[PDB]
Symmetry: D2
Subunit: 445 residues, 4 copies
């Protein structure tokens, strides 16, 4: 008609309807068909969206994810649903069940990790539970009793095994670990990934998303799948990966999230009387990774750089990852003002052709910008939510509110799209994406 | 805390979460455990609550109900879920699968009917679909193409087989057909139901609702189950029921709903160019049952009476059914003003001890009033919704708005209870009741 | 910026801020500068807008208007603010203070009337007061005691002096009495107004609204001002006007409003135990003017026609006044369906170039349509409100809701414009128009 | 009736209606009758409440206040409305027009100051203006050009003349300068004020508020009015006040507000390219007064203490002023956790008998607590707003949200009371208090 948008109550209802519709029982799929399994950072955001509906079911979501945690503490980025096909690479291609000595016996998983937003979900669950009364607080507190150790082991694995040199930045062995598969951030590192004898495969993602402008290329998937062959050759052994992987990058955005997550989990630990040594370690890691993020930044603009460990070079790109230091703090005053000017100016939120005042995944003025192509340009509601929540935590109440307002406007069509075209607002990627519904649910209050 | 109520967006989200949680696939249970099957008038209200979430799934709900329609047109009041136990009387006790020649081959059902609110659900589906654009309008219009004949056959069975004498009132053979099992309306008729050799049975309803003050008595269930034996003895044959049933009442509230439903379906038929003869029949029945309702009314107060066909006597009770004429219209001006004074005065919505300005199922000043006991007093959100929608259709915009406002206040605890204590607001009956969530969903807009 | 619309709470606050800003103390101006006095039907809508803010002040607004009522019962269409210039024709031009024996001694007023929406405002005040508690109900009931007789005298003057032949239509002697100065409705009647020696004047309205496309022409004003000379020459004597006025029309929209207002006031009289003879007269007039409206209607479409008393001919134009029978009822079922099809189709609300699904003052497909020119095309929020309220009173809950939704969308710029361009949504006429704020407040209060 | 609360849109409308009603033209009175003039920190909150309604009028409010600024930079706490009586002490009693060489020539003012919340109001005006488009941004930027120097002179007067020893705390010479006339904070200092021959007077405040339990005693007013005699005797000369005043206290809450205001104004200066030397001074003062606040704090709880300059002793009381360090920051991590535990525990927001989870002006468990008596116990909406805004600025998003939620619940009666009884929620003090409406509008605008 004249207005296809939904009212706040309609939109909240449809978002909860979606989330319950993607529930398999104890895990929520990231999307109905494109991503028909549990993903790690999606599961954190799903728990955030479930917290206003059922603290009990939000806790179940994190319990299911943690039940897939590897023996060394790694949370793998996919927990596969039993008997479900339709996603590639699936369990047979990872072969972690037969090759990975640390993989769980009772879940099929991938063999790589994803960003540690999980502590933020725990905070939102606790915040909801404290408004709901004693029986609900008891549910959330029982979850802390049951899973505090597992959360510690997750943060410790990141701090000790992916920051072996105590640089305060997380090393990745796959671009998929960044959450941003085809981000321009990784192009120069991927250009040095030379596949050898790569076993034949058929993609499934572009059978579901048929528009070729919206997904990575075959050449990019060849490199993604070649890194799997390198990992499988060493049976996913942490100790051997630095010797064999053709892709080794320090991810400054993942690092900033980790800093925030450690500080959040330390505050939880203080409030719920968790072991002093754990809280002390969490604060130490929060500070170490805050400093590691700051060390990457341009001394003029504050923009954070990734680092190619193999090439030994800073990776200078124009993506939303540059704003990593805004999430965790630590910049000198003048540098942070410069970085905020970059965020709000014509290269990002201030670009005159954007439909919404939101943060594109790649700067529209970058040569790498592609308005439809996944992480090369589109606006991702999950990043809107993460930036808005971290900005509110910095004390930037109006900046956070504006992102939430624009994210709700963008989402008001009810498509709950994976990402959106930055100029037209066209929904792109999968529809019915669980963390887009969760973002709306958290925002609407 | 200081305030356990939910905001409108929170409440809408939780109501949709509930509705999707009670979805078995193609049917929604009336409640998670007490009523773990599809009920007929509940399914209409569920379709109303689904319409803002998914016109496609709202249509599915009515398709599933109509697929259980009997060969003679009757919509049975329970469509049992395959393999589901926990409700008594269940499929084995009804034995319609082996005894009822008109029962559907591919569904297990009860052998009695329930009120014809279904046309109202169709109207709400169409209203939503018209705001959503062409593909959604096509879904709703395709449903009309597919099911108009079945809806006609339902209304025709009521008009021809339950009003054989063309009195403009529907005859019931079981109090369960009224929707109000233990209403004081039926006490004097039930007092003449003398069970003979009644086969042993174990109730399930009071294993789930253990508080004896909230459910009918064993003596009442003995009579409910004896009527089943009388119906089974004649193989549920319409032609033989008047000769054998110990309970035969004309239900003025069911009759008023039928009048409204015929008028609504006639208006749909005009708008979507359905057969002229059908629309003509629907308007004729709407007028006949409006007149039949008016004929029951007290000439002073307008209060509508039920009629005991066996005793040949008007049934004078003080329940919400007295307000039947307000739903369908037809009263003389002075009589309708008197009936509205009764509704708004100290015997119903104006009673000084009520927590909310809502319509109790039995007048709190009646000797039959029991504040916890099912239809003998509690406030039912489903009746709030039905009265508010019919009042808005009369043009009584402020009266309708006040009922909606108070119903939302009552529902703001998020219990989605089956019924509520009228003085304290305590949630009673089953929690997580589907038509209470549907009422909230329709209201919140 | 990206979206310059206000939220509902922002919009409600700004609407109330406007209405208080236009308050001179005991009267609210219709606008800040263009209309810096009290107008009669505006004052009724202002009272509706004040009722959610202050029942006491809403009652004051109507008391002030009724203190200007003429000795014969006429409510004049302007009550001038003492010492205020800036509007023409002003008190000196009307000369009612020196020429009109029935004009009030203690107010300066115009010498013509305006539509009787006042009973609708009384109903809204009473509805608000009944939600607010005993002290506020007493305020509203005291107003009824004080002003019931004046309201009766107003209705009686219309029924007896402007329907002298008991035709059930109100005769007007000036297009300004219709509320729609330059409606195409009056063009052929105005073509038969031939001014004599008209005293020189200077307009004020087009000094404030300088865009010539938005106000009537000088030629139109010459005729408006000449009719004043004709009234002044007979000292505004009711009995003489039929013999001297060059403009005499039966206004079918005014007539339908009067039918509704009589029925509304009759219901108020019953509820508050006013004299039975008054209630009986009100219902008689409601019926007479309903029938009078229906008698004008097109046999195919149901559209209502005005009547030129001097030319003795039906006035056939394509304006929103055609929809008069929808307000008061009375059409046969088939013809009202045809009239609603006209309303919702491509000649009015369904025209494909309209920005909002609202009723233009003149059909966009009529040769008379002018998209900027006052009553010749623009969308008026006051008419949106009146149609929405009357439609809800007919029982057409969804139709009323859609008009309210589109009216709120149009008003969400916060300009509170007098009227809006139908295709672009550009605000036109005066900004900060009191009855546009009142519509918004009622729709949200 | 059943619930006398207003909806958010109703409440926002009534709040704006109130604020416009208290507008005299270019100044808004703090209340209709009790406070019928402009007060300094009220005017800052009024500007915050006007910003969502009219950036232009919000700017006017601060322009009017700053036009009363004294020649030395002091903003006086009252700007009297010309020709208005009804408040005591009025202009004749202050005699600043004849005795104070620094008082403005064209305004009548008091001779003491009030807390510097004004920069917070400027920030809110700028935030609103940036959402409204170019013309509105220009209005706000023009105000900065016109008044930046005056704002600097205000901050400089506080830092240089009320912190002469650079201790980082503001000295007051009257309890009225704290904003909290009869706070238990000042009881021991007031016990050392011995009036001489005090000129006879009659109070006005307790003729308007007649309940003696709600205002200070005559004995307290004798001391308030005697301090005026001491100031008048030295012609309000800043350099003489330390030698003659019987009341000299360092106000830690005023100091923390000043710290925040300096940081806020410094950020405004950076964003709008104000002189670098001014920004540098503002950040220096922000740091100095932060440290000055922290130096007062209890080593166990972190609670901030006031200081009696004459008695040379720390003032230890149990009032909301203890929470000053939460506003400005600076406490060590462990002590701020202790201070938040005090805030949220049973001595303040977690007291089990409080109707709302809000901060009482005096702890309910203190021997000084009086639940009706002005600053000795009642909950003040203005403090709820200030704490919520400062908490959001610290990053404590959920804590700020809970204060806002409870503040809106308390205000939903629409009384807009000056303060509220902490246990019953009874509205106390003046009704229709401007800064209570402003808090509501900001929380909803
Ligand atoms: O493209 C893919 O196959 C997967 C690879 O893990 O990645 C996409 O989908 C995941 C689930 O929604 C997200 O977690 C990622 O952030 C997003 O990029
Ligand atoms: O008590 C029962 O076993 C059943 C008998 O049909 O009845 C109750 O539950 C049904 C499903 O919710 C409702 O349809 C009825 O209105 C309500 O009275
Ligand atoms: O143009 C004018 O001078 C006057 C003449 O009465 O008319 C306009 O202003 C009035 C006040 O707003 C409205 O009552 C009318 O409906 C509107 O047409
Ligand atoms: O009691 C009084 O006469 C005055 C003295 O300035 O103080 C009260 O009123 C002011 C205006 O509302 C507020 O600024 C104060 O905070 C409040 O305590």
């Amino acid at each position: 008609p004249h207005d296809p948008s939904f009212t706040p109550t309609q939109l909240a209802a449809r978002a909860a309807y979606l989330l319950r519709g993607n529930d398999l029982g104890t895990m929520t799929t990231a999307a109905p068909l494109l991503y028909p399994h549990m993903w790690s950072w999606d599961a954190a955001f799903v728990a955030i969206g479930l917290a206003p509906l059922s603290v009990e079911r939000a806790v179940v979501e994190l319990d299911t994810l943690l039940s897939a945690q590897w023996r060394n503490g790694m949370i793998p980025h996919i927990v596969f649903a039993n008997g479900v096909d339709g996603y590639f690479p699936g369990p047979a291609r990872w072969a972690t069940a037969t090759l990975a000595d640390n993989a769980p016996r009772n879940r099929l998983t991938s063999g790589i990790t994803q960003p540690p937003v999980h502590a933020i979900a725990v905070q939102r669950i606790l915040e909801h539970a404290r408004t709901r009364g004693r029986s609900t607080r008891a549910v959330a507190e029982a979850f802390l009793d049951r899973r505090w150790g597992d959360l510690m082991r997750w943060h410790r694995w990141l701090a000790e095994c992916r920051d072996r040199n105590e640089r305060g930045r997380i090393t990745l062995y796959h671009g998929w670990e960044s959450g941003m598969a085809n981000s321009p951030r990784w192009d120069s590192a991927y250009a040095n990934v030379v596949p050898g004898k790569l076993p034949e495969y058929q993609r499934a993602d572009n059978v579901i998303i048929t528009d070729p402008s919206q997904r990575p290329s075959d050449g990019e998937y060849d490199r993604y799948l070649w890194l799997l062959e390198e990992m499988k050759a060493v049976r996913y052994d942490d100790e051997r990966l630095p010797s064999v992987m053709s892709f080794q990058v320090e991810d400054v955005f993942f690092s900033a999230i980790f800093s925030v997550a450690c500080q959040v989990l330390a505050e939880i630990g203080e409030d719920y009387k968790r072991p002093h040594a754990d809280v002390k370690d969490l604060y130490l890691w929060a500070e170490r990774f805050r400093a590691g993020v700051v060390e990457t930044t341009d001394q003029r603009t504050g923009a954070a750089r990734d680092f190619d460990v193999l090439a030994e070079k800073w990776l200078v790109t124009e993506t939303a990852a540059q704003f990593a230091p805004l999430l965790c703090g630590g910049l000198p005053h003048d540098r942070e003002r410069a970085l905020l000017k970059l965020l709000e100016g014509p290269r990002f939120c201030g670009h005159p052709d954007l439909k919404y005042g939101l943060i594109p995944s790649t700067s529209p003025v970058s040569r790498d910008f592609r308005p439809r192509e996944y992480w090369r340009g589109p606006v991702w509601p999950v990043l809107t939510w993460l930036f808005s929540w971290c900005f509110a935590r910095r004390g930037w109440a109006e900046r956070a509110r504006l992102l939430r307002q624009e994210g709700l406007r963008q989402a008001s069509d009810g498509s709950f799209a994976e990402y959106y075209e930055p100029f037209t607002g066209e929904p792109l990627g999968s529809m019915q994406q669980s963390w887009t519904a969760a973002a709306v649910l958290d925002w609407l209050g």
